[PDB]
Write a protein that binds this ligand. Structure first.
Ligand SMILES: CC(C)CN(C[C@@H](O)[C@H](Cc1ccccc1)NC(=O)O[C@H]1CO[C@H]2OCC[C@H]21)S(=O)(=O)c1ccc(N)cc1
Lengths: 99, 99
């Protein structure tokens, strides 16, 4: 689909058997989700944003279905105030910016 | 232009007579630029992102030229780690997300 930007580009995703809403975010290198239960093993990592940094758990090769499109890749989990789909997954679903 | 997301979607902008590079950021409601000299009056404001909040200066009716497309609107200035073009300006240049 084509998505205009008069509102937040929020999309429904399914991950870890759970349904969530997440922001399609071209400004985010990596995907980061609020605290949630995920199956795998994980590595501690820290990511930097506007107000400083947060500590996250890195999960690799995690399946996500973003608006009915599957992708597998790194998901970070931690105290982000919003679920963010970053460019690492956006590229997999063929998402582009257009003007 | 159509822009893929294997790299950061950085674009050259002109604002306040100065040239900068900024991220086209669908995840950002508002445009926020690193500390810079801008003409005019302003108002204290706080914006929140991944690591917490920062205090910014809000400038209204500011002219920006983003990839050669003019837009006028609100620009926040403050200690963001990167210059961000947010949805308030992206809509003005007809920027959309497609997959
Ligand atoms: C622009 C950078 C700082 C990157 N940020 C992505 C960005 O889209 C965040 C994503 C975001 C979105 C909502 C809340 C927090 C973070 N948006 C954001 O900070 O926007 C602020 C300016 O406008 C306002 O609208 C939303 C928050 C304000 S980030 O969230 O910090 C980020 C950094 C690293 C990764 N891997 C993933 C995300």
């Amino acid at each position: 689909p084509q998505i205009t930007l008069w509102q937040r580009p929020l999309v429904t995703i399914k991950i870890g058997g759970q349904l969530k809403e997440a922001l399609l975010d071209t400004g985010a290198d990596d995907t980061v989700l609020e605290e949630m239960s995920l199956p795998g093993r994980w590595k501690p990592k820290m990511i930097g944003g506007i107000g400083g940094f947060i500590k996250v758990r890195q999960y690799d090769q995690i399946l996500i279905e973003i608006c009915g499109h599957k992708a597998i890749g790194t998901v970070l989990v931690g105290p982000t105030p919003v679920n963010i789909i970053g460019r690492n997954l956006l590229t997999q679903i063929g998402c582009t910016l257009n003007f």
